[PDB]
Design a protein around this nucleic acid. Structure first.
Length: 105
RNA sequence: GGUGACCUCCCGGGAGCGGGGGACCACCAGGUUGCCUAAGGAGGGGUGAACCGGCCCAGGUCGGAAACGGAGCAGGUCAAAACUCCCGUGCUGAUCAGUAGUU
């Protein structure tokens, strides 16, 4: 239950910083989905679980392609980093951003 | 000096979110002014909706165990998106009396 949250808004290049986004547009992507996010995180060997029915507070678009939240574990609950490659939320996001595009395209 | 946006960094957080460094843009107030006008007030208003302003936001809604918060509707509201009318100012058609002043 002590896992960092991650909304797809954080990575969406068609959203302003005030609309949620957490990473520079240059590194961001178009319309990332919680599904896409979970898949690229898990596939690197991260412990991730997907909450299909959480919405972003700042998200306004009531249709399914923008719903969703991805929870990720960084820590084994002895305080140590599950992985050394992923110390921070930002380190997660930037990676997901880097990996999502190799899927569909 | 102010407002609103937008971009890019840190920092704290399980969320909504919290702390802080830069960059840029728009507008505002009112303090000096000009290689400035034919004349250019630092006026007065109104719209600000079907989503585009900003603010306050019932409900609802998203996040939350909750506190509370986000986004924001109906309604209210504006020194400060944008739009627009009026006043002033400048040129510029025109009207009336057959009015004069003087023939």
């Amino acid at each position: 239950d002590r896992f960092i949250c991650i909304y797809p808004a954080y990575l969406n290049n068609k959203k302003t910083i005030a609309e949620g986004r957490r990473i520079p547009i240059s590194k961001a992507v178009e319309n990332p989905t919680a599904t896409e996010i979970q898949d690229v995180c898990s596939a690197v060997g991260l412990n991730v679980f997907l909450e299909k029915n959480k919405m972003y507070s700042r998200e306004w678009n009531r249709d399914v392609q923008y719903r969703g939240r991805v929870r990720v574990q960084l820590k084994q609950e002895d305080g140590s980093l599950c992985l050394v490659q992923f110390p921070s939320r930002k380190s997660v996001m930037l990676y997901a951003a880097e990996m999502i595009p190799k899927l569909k395209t």
